[PDB]
Amino acid sequence: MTTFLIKHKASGKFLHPKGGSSNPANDTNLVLHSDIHERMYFQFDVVDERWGYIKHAASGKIVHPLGGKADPPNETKLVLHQDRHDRALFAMDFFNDNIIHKAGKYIHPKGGSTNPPNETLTVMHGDKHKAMEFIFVSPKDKDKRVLVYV
Amino acid sequence: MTTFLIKHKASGKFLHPKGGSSNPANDTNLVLHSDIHERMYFQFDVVDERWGYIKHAASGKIVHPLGGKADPPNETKLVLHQDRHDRALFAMDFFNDNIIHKAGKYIHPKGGSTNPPNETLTVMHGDKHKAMEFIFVSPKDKDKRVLVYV
Amino acid sequence: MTTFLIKHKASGKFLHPKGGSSNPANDTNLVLHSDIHERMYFQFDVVDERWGYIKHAASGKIVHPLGGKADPPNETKLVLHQDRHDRALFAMDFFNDNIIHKAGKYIHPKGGSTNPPNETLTVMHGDKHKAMEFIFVSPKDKDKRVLVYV
Amino acid sequence: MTTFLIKHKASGKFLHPKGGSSNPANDTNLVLHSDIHERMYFQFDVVDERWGYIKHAASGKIVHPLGGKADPPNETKLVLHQDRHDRALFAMDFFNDNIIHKAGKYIHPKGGSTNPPNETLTVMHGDKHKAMEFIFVSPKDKDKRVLVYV
Amino acid sequence: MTTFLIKHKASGKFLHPKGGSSNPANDTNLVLHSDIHERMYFQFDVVDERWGYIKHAASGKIVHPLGGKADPPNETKLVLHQDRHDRALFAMDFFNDNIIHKAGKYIHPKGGSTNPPNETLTVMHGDKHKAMEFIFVSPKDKDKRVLVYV
Amino acid sequence: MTTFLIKHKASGKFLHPKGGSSNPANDTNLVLHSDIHERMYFQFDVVDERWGYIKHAASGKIVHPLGGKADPPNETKLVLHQDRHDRALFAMDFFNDNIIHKAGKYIHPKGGSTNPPNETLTVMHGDKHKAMEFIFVSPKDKDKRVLVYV
Amino acid sequence: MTTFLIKHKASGKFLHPKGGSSNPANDTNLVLHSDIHERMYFQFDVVDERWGYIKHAASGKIVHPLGGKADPPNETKLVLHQDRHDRALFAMDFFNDNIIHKAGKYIHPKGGSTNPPNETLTVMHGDKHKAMEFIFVSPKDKDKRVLVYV
Amino acid sequence: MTTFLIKHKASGKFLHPKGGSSNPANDTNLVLHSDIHERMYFQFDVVDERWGYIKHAASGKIVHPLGGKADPPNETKLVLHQDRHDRALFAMDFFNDNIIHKAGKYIHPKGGSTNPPNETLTVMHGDKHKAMEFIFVSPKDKDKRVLVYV
Numbered sequence A, B, C, D, E, F, G, H: 001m002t003t004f005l006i007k008h009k010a011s012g013k014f015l016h017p018k019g020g021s022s023n024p025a026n027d028t029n030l031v032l033h034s035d036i037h038e039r040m041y042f043q044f045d046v047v048d049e050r051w052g053y054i055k056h057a058a059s060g061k062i063v064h065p066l067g068g069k070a071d072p073p074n075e076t077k078l079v080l081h082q083d084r085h086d087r088a089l090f091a092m093d094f095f096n097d098n099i100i101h102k103a104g105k106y107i108h109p110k111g112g113s114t115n116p117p118n119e120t121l122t123v124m125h126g127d128k129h130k131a132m133e134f135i136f137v138s139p140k141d142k143d144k145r146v147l148v149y150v
């Protein structure tokens, strides 16, 4: 119900749908971009305890591994899509500051840079480090963390 | 951009947010009113084939059954609300001239009159008849139908 | 812009040009056939709100009443022809699941059977019933309806 | 609003008020005990993102470091007290499975045993290890984790 | 005694009798279909360790290779028949997620597609891949696996 | 209910409690022995679909990884213990012919021999090969497989 | 391996399998009888502190509440059965001179007589009184108590 | 052989030799104290059915009524002594949770308090109540009852 920004901790860029559309088509990539606007706001819909759907606020589309596989390999691109199923389940780990897929991999910027340029893609990948950390912040204050499970 | 007016076919009144605000609050009632102006313009964002969100152009808020239930009972009030989810999915049936919710009920004027007075609320109701028919027309020509899926 | 199959709902057969050619000559009849291939893919080119041209993807030819009359009588054969004009305008009614001509008659299998055999001609006819119903589906998923007005 | 048990992961014992009362007096010690009953149910009242009050369901008393200091030293006993203030703020880290105080120390069984006996006190302590891990489970199923931030 | 749905893992469609009847005639072909209802529930009657009869719950008819041969060739259609005999013995391999006939071939969708359309026939075939995998799930929860050997 | 022998496929030895006791004490090691007698009979108590407890028939004690950890390391010795909990859950894979722990490792003879000598210990280990294969056979016929999920 | 007779204190009769067989069938009733012979000798196999299995020496079958329920109602018959599990756990209280089931009821002669006749059934019942008292004596000296916990 | 702590049930204190020596002098008093260490571990040497010697683990001395009389009166102090004879015979009643001497009196805290101070003497007394109850627990887990007769 409460919206938030998905902030790449190391760079301060944010998770965007590639193109900034309020109704991006299915299979649109999610990229990192510095801009802030209501078409990059997200919500989280809890399904089972920690697990839920990361939902693009403007369109209602949720985050999927491209292809919708249960255990996607490293470098699988992340995309938006209307389908709901248990292969698009993520947890918003606001204590270790990362986003983990049901199958155990994390959301990374493609290439692992602490300062990725605008339009940089995001991918699934199993490594843990400072460049795959994300924090969840208020649309009205990019430095104020908000609870995404409420 | 593809804007239209939601015209009650039998009376020629139009769907308005109650109060005519460019920024109606969440849970603002949708009423019928004779007036035409920018704050009663609508858009339609396709989600899944025929299904999508009916969006108030001035505010970006979309049409919901009050309470957001998947299968709202007859007389459930229709409101505007910022959330996007599957219980706010409608189809714009421009062949039978009605607006159908994902769960199979239609938008009606409350009371079912062919000539409802100004400020009459709209509600969900399962019946099909002449007084729940709507057509989708150009803001600049209230008699010209326009394609809302485009 | 969007490619689809025209599937006869009652039988699961599809609309084909007679002979299955990627360049059927002008006035080639349109028939029903069980086969699937890219020479039976169609597109829809919107002209005026609901009205547009039903286009054979492989040849660019569009659906016409044979003879190109504005108000064709019942049993008028449907053919492919390269010409674009007003008398070849149809609407794709995906709510009642039929194909309606500008003058108000519908596309039928000749004889009105729910299970017409392969090579059955198609004709214009004014009746509405289960055997003149068509749905518009993805070439890669004959059970998934797609939006043709896009 | 969601009621849960605070289960010490290594031993399977639970957090109790010392004495098991439905109205333990102010400054009653929190202990570990194997028993399950309504007087060891807890709730969590969110105050500011991750931070909130750990609330004894039966009495409404919340968890405090004894003395209520902002930055309590190691071995500070944990007690129940009715007062609400910022020195009683905790986070329920359900990803690393621990309970952290606003000043950065964690809830431990006194002595750090993986199998603390019934009546063992709990204390603030800065170390992180397997014996200070807690999970938050359903009262009707001690192995089913539940979301405490809802 | 345990009722389940036979879900094609790759597509999420289910095994149906062709036509969906509660009493399909002998030699009715088994197909894949997305629908769920009481006439696609199955049971498994153990005969000899892993081997038994796959039984259509509504009719009591069991799965046979068409013609009832002991060692059916690839592409042999699967049908329902009331007879019980050794050539209708199958095992429900819930570890590798497939259905194996006594003679060593597996149940496949005809053509081996990961997304077979509704009414796709099923056939015996010797290949093993992700297009011939099936899981056995609860009639009330299509994602919950159930034990069929009881 | 059905009692069976757990036979090491490569050698024909069986899983015994080290000592052949009808009531072996807690933490008694599970070793391979050629002998057959009622004190090496096992049962399987289903808990959740494929998962259950491997139970020593004579004593009612079940198989545990030594230490009872959820994710035991390679070479962890498997022993008998009277406790029931979700870290002693196994599956009896009679299609691939192995015994898998809830955390994904398999029961092996210590050392991985196709011909393990009497009193060879058994351990958890993640590798898959011919020397860790087991089949489940009738006490009255060591070559007749029996269904353990019954 | 300590063998004993279960002597009804008030009458001096003994617990027998109905029929006196060295191999009583599963679900054979346990009755009181005056006779002494090796086919009414019992053993006790400690499982958890005070709790264990009461074992018929000649057959290895143990005492069960008929039906094997965890909390059997009053008048539930006691039988012999080969299965080992938690619902067949008893304690031999040689201080208060009774036999208590894990769920808290005691072994009684059916009807509660201080002098029940031969072939009197035994049942579970919650009452404590003189007629449900039993002592555990040497087979070779019916007045010498022996310690059954060994 | 089994080693245990003698725990006063009402207070949670334990039986100690006065002063806690690993070799108490003969006739050293037995007292209650809250400390746990190896100089207050006990064992039970079974002599005749329920009767045996309560042996101090550290010294091998056993519990005696001071004076070694067969029928000690109320308030007779309990001491440790090396002598082994029948006037030092006790039974460990783990069903009624008490320690009874062969002449029929019980071990009590002197004064019968539910919560006696450290160094409270123990005496013989015929009374039965909550304050003379003891349980027998594991040296690694003061809450786990252990069977002292094996």
Ligand SMILES: OC[C@H]1O[C@H](OC[C@H]2O[C@H](O[C@]3(CO)O[C@H](CO)[C@@H](O)[C@@H]3O)[C@H](O)[C@@H](O)[C@@H]2O)[C@H](O)[C@@H](O)[C@H]1O
Residues within 6 Å of the ligand: A026, A027, A064, A065, A066, A067, A068, A069, A079, A081, A083, A085, A088, C140
């Ligand atoms: O990416 C998330 C999406 O993954 C899966 O859907 C993939 C894709 O399937 C279909 O696309 C095509 C064309 O119709 O289908 C075949 C499947 O191999 C491909 O050639 C091609 O991508 C759908 O039409 C697409 O909308 C869809 O994105 C999964 O099934 C989805 O639920 C979703 O998780």
Ligand SMILES: OC[C@H]1O[C@H](OC[C@H]2O[C@H](O[C@]3(CO)O[C@H](CO)[C@@H](O)[C@@H]3O)[C@H](O)[C@@H](O)[C@@H]2O)[C@H](O)[C@@H](O)[C@H]1O
Residues within 6 Å of the ligand: A075, A108, A109, A110, A111, A112, A113, A123, A125, A127, A129, A132
């Ligand atoms: O994309 C996510 C990934 O970004 C970083 O790695 C990018 C790197 O991936 C591949 O290089 C290798 C070899 O396959 O992968 C590891 C990282 O897992 C690198 O050490 C190694 O070069 C591509 O071949 C490269 O082109 C690309 O630069 C980051 O290091 C990873 O943790 C992860 O975030």
Ligand SMILES: OC[C@H]1O[C@H](OC[C@H]2O[C@H](O[C@]3(CO)O[C@H](CO)[C@@H](O)[C@@H]3O)[C@H](O)[C@@H](O)[C@@H]2O)[C@H](O)[C@@H](O)[C@H]1O
Residues within 6 Å of the ligand: B026, B027, B064, B065, B066, B067, B068, B069, B079, B081, B083, B085, B087
């Ligand atoms: O009606 C569309 C809207 O319905 C749901 O949100 C309803 C409403 O919830 C809150 O209002 C109250 C205040 O507690 O909450 C309950 C409903 O749970 C009502 O009794 C009362 O009005 C919020 O304050 C409102 O902003 C919110 O609109 C649903 O959750 C929404 O997604 C949407 O579908």
Ligand SMILES: OC[C@H]1O[C@H](OC[C@H]2O[C@H](O[C@]3(CO)O[C@H](CO)[C@@H](O)[C@@H]3O)[C@H](O)[C@@H](O)[C@@H]2O)[C@H](O)[C@@H](O)[C@H]1O
Residues within 6 Å of the ligand: B075, B108, B109, B110, B111, B112, B113, B123, B125, B127, B129, B131, B132
């Ligand atoms: O609000 C939309 C609704 O208006 C009319 O129905 C209002 C009507 O509903 C109920 O009356 C009944 C009972 O369901 O409805 C039918 C007619 O639909 C009547 O036989 C019966 O009175 C309420 O109890 C009444 O207060 C209220 O008058 C219209 O008829 C509906 O089709 C629909 O447009």
Ligand SMILES: OC[C@H]1O[C@H](OC[C@H]2O[C@H](O[C@]3(CO)O[C@H](CO)[C@@H](O)[C@@H]3O)[C@H](O)[C@@H](O)[C@@H]2O)[C@H](O)[C@@H](O)[C@H]1O
Residues within 6 Å of the ligand: C016, C017, C018, C019, C020, C021, C031, C032, C033, C035, C036, C037, C040, C118, C119
């Ligand atoms: O009309 C739709 C249909 O066109 C093509 O098939 C036409 C017809 O051709 C072949 O059958 C035969 C034998 O070659 O061809 C002549 C046509 O005059 C007939 O005498 C005879 O049936 C095809 O094998 C048949 O399927 C078909 O009936 C095209 O091949 C079809 O896919 C379909 O598009």
Ligand SMILES: OC[C@H]1O[C@H](OC[C@H]2O[C@H](O[C@]3(CO)O[C@H](CO)[C@@H](O)[C@@H]3O)[C@H](O)[C@@H](O)[C@@H]2O)[C@H](O)[C@@H](O)[C@H]1O
Residues within 6 Å of the ligand: C026, C027, C064, C065, C066, C067, C068, C069, C079, C081, C083, C085, C087, C088
């Ligand atoms: O069938 C659709 C087509 O109808 C019209 O064109 C018909 C047809 O006319 C000419 O063919 C003939 C003979 O030359 O003329 C009559 C009709 O006037 C026909 O019986 C016969 O085939 C042309 O030579 C053909 O090209 C043409 O198809 C109309 O004008 C077209 O736009 C189109 O709608």
Ligand SMILES: OC[C@H]1O[C@H](OC[C@H]2O[C@H](O[C@]3(CO)O[C@H](CO)[C@@H](O)[C@@H]3O)[C@H](O)[C@@H](O)[C@@H]2O)[C@H](O)[C@@H](O)[C@H]1O
Residues within 6 Å of the ligand: C075, C108, C109, C110, C111, C112, C113, C123, C125, C127, C129, C131, C132
């Ligand atoms: O071709 C499409 C058409 O097929 C069926 O009608 C064929 C039918 O038409 C005429 O029969 C009658 C009598 O004039 O016309 C009406 C309209 O269909 C029929 O009720 C009646 O049989 C021809 O004279 C007949 O020879 C021919 O069989 C179908 O019934 C129509 O709905 C339509 O789909």
Ligand SMILES: OC[C@H]1O[C@H](OC[C@H]2O[C@H](O[C@]3(CO)O[C@H](CO)[C@@H](O)[C@@H]3O)[C@H](O)[C@@H](O)[C@@H]2O)[C@H](O)[C@@H](O)[C@H]1O
Residues within 6 Å of the ligand: D016, D017, D018, D019, D020, D021, D031, D033, D035, D036, D037, D040, D118, D119, H009, H010, H011, H012
């Ligand atoms: O502190 C949590 C615990 O409180 C209650 O149990 C206390 C205590 O009860 C029994 O111990 C004794 C003696 O039997 O009973 C009184 C009651 O306070 C104690 O002074 C004394 O130790 C039990 O034997 C112990 O398990 C327990 O520690 C409550 O009943 C428990 O459920 C639990 O909430």
Ligand SMILES: OC[C@H]1O[C@H](OC[C@H]2O[C@H](O[C@]3(CO)O[C@H](CO)[C@@H](O)[C@@H]3O)[C@H](O)[C@@H](O)[C@@H]2O)[C@H](O)[C@@H](O)[C@H]1O
Residues within 6 Å of the ligand: D026, D027, D064, D065, D066, D067, D068, D069, D079, D081, D083, D085, D087
């Ligand atoms: O422990 C949590 C509690 O700490 C603070 O209150 C402590 C304590 O203060 C008073 O109790 C006494 C006796 O009057 O006062 C001193 C501390 O000043 C203590 O040694 C002693 O217990 C109150 O009467 C008690 O209610 C209170 O528990 C703090 O003020 C509370 O908000 C709370 O955090």
Ligand SMILES: OC[C@H]1O[C@H](OC[C@H]2O[C@H](O[C@]3(CO)O[C@H](CO)[C@@H](O)[C@@H]3O)[C@H](O)[C@@H](O)[C@@H]2O)[C@H](O)[C@@H](O)[C@H]1O
Residues within 6 Å of the ligand: C009, C010, C011, C012, E016, E017, E018, E019, E020, E021, E031, E033, E035, E036, E037, E040, E118, E119
């Ligand atoms: O075969 C399994 C399937 O059987 C039933 O559905 C059959 C069919 O129903 C509809 O199609 C029609 C109209 O009733 O039925 C025949 C069957 O071939 C077709 O000619 C005609 O289109 C649906 O449109 C189809 O999806 C469906 O295949 C049953 O109702 C299903 O639940 C299922 O069990």
Ligand SMILES: OC[C@H]1O[C@H](OC[C@H]2O[C@H](O[C@]3(CO)O[C@H](CO)[C@@H](O)[C@@H]3O)[C@H](O)[C@@H](O)[C@@H]2O)[C@H](O)[C@@H](O)[C@H]1O
Residues within 6 Å of the ligand: E026, E027, E064, E065, E066, E067, E068, E069, E079, E081, E083, E085, E087
């Ligand atoms: O298909 C499973 C079925 O196979 C065997 O029976 C086949 C079938 O035999 C008869 O059907 C036909 C036509 O009458 O007979 C020939 C084969 O002889 C086939 O071309 C055709 O299907 C019977 O009329 C059917 O009842 C019967 O199903 C086998 O005997 C059955 O037990 C069963 O396994």
Ligand SMILES: OC[C@H]1O[C@H](OC[C@H]2O[C@H](O[C@]3(CO)O[C@H](CO)[C@@H](O)[C@@H]3O)[C@H](O)[C@@H](O)[C@@H]2O)[C@H](O)[C@@H](O)[C@H]1O
Residues within 6 Å of the ligand: E075, E108, E109, E110, E111, E112, E113, E123, E125, E127, E128, E129, E131, E132
């Ligand atoms: O029906 C299930 C089957 O579907 C696919 O095979 C269909 C395919 O089989 C044959 O094609 C080849 C060439 O002989 O045979 C093998 C499979 O045996 C294929 O690799 C290869 O294409 C037929 O000749 C074709 O007409 C037919 O389309 C799938 O490949 C199989 O695994 C199985 O799932």
Ligand SMILES: OC[C@H]1O[C@H](OC[C@H]2O[C@H](O[C@]3(CO)O[C@H](CO)[C@@H](O)[C@@H]3O)[C@H](O)[C@@H](O)[C@@H]2O)[C@H](O)[C@@H](O)[C@H]1O
Residues within 6 Å of the ligand: D115, F026, F027, F064, F065, F066, F067, F068, F069, F079, F081, F083, F085, F088, H140
């Ligand atoms: O091996 C299966 C067994 O593992 C776990 O228990 C281990 C062990 O715990 C106790 O033994 C000791 C000493 O009493 O207790 C600690 C663990 O708390 C160990 O370091 C030490 O061995 C029991 O007395 C033993 O019986 C037990 O085997 C697990 O807790 C058990 O449920 C079971 O899975």
Ligand SMILES: OC[C@H]1O[C@H](OC[C@H]2O[C@H](O[C@]3(CO)O[C@H](CO)[C@@H](O)[C@@H]3O)[C@H](O)[C@@H](O)[C@@H]2O)[C@H](O)[C@@H](O)[C@H]1O
Residues within 6 Å of the ligand: F075, F108, F109, F110, F111, F112, F113, F123, F125, F127, F129, F132
């Ligand atoms: O005991 C289970 C294990 O047995 C076999 O593997 C033994 C051991 O082999 C390798 O490790 C070495 C090298 O041979 O062997 C000893 C321990 O036995 C170690 O000092 C040394 O690293 C492998 O790396 C290990 O997997 C394994 O522990 C058998 O081959 C294994 O599959 C497994 O069954």
Ligand SMILES: OC[C@H]1O[C@H](OC[C@H]2O[C@H](O[C@]3(CO)O[C@H](CO)[C@@H](O)[C@@H]3O)[C@H](O)[C@@H](O)[C@@H]2O)[C@H](O)[C@@H](O)[C@H]1O
Residues within 6 Å of the ligand: G075, G108, G109, G110, G111, G112, G113, G123, G125, G127, G129, G131, G132
């Ligand atoms: O069999 C063990 C049982 O024997 C005696 O109870 C037998 C008693 O049971 C039923 O009568 C009642 C009422 O239905 O059940 C309670 C059980 O105590 C009795 O108060 C009451 O009579 C039978 O229908 C009666 O005929 C029969 O008298 C004995 O009372 C129990 O303590 C126990 O030893």
Ligand SMILES: OC[C@H]1O[C@H](OC[C@H]2O[C@H](O[C@]3(CO)O[C@H](CO)[C@@H](O)[C@@H]3O)[C@H](O)[C@@H](O)[C@@H]2O)[C@H](O)[C@@H](O)[C@H]1O
Residues within 6 Å of the ligand: H016, H017, H018, H019, H020, H021, H031, H033, H035, H036, H037, H040, H118, H119
């Ligand atoms: O009697 C049982 C008791 O003996 C030992 O303690 C006796 C001892 O207590 C006091 O000494 C100290 C310090 O005050 O008290 C604790 C025990 O309460 C000891 O750690 C420490 O020495 C008295 O001051 C002494 O006069 C008296 O002899 C033993 O240490 C205890 O564990 C316990 O077994």
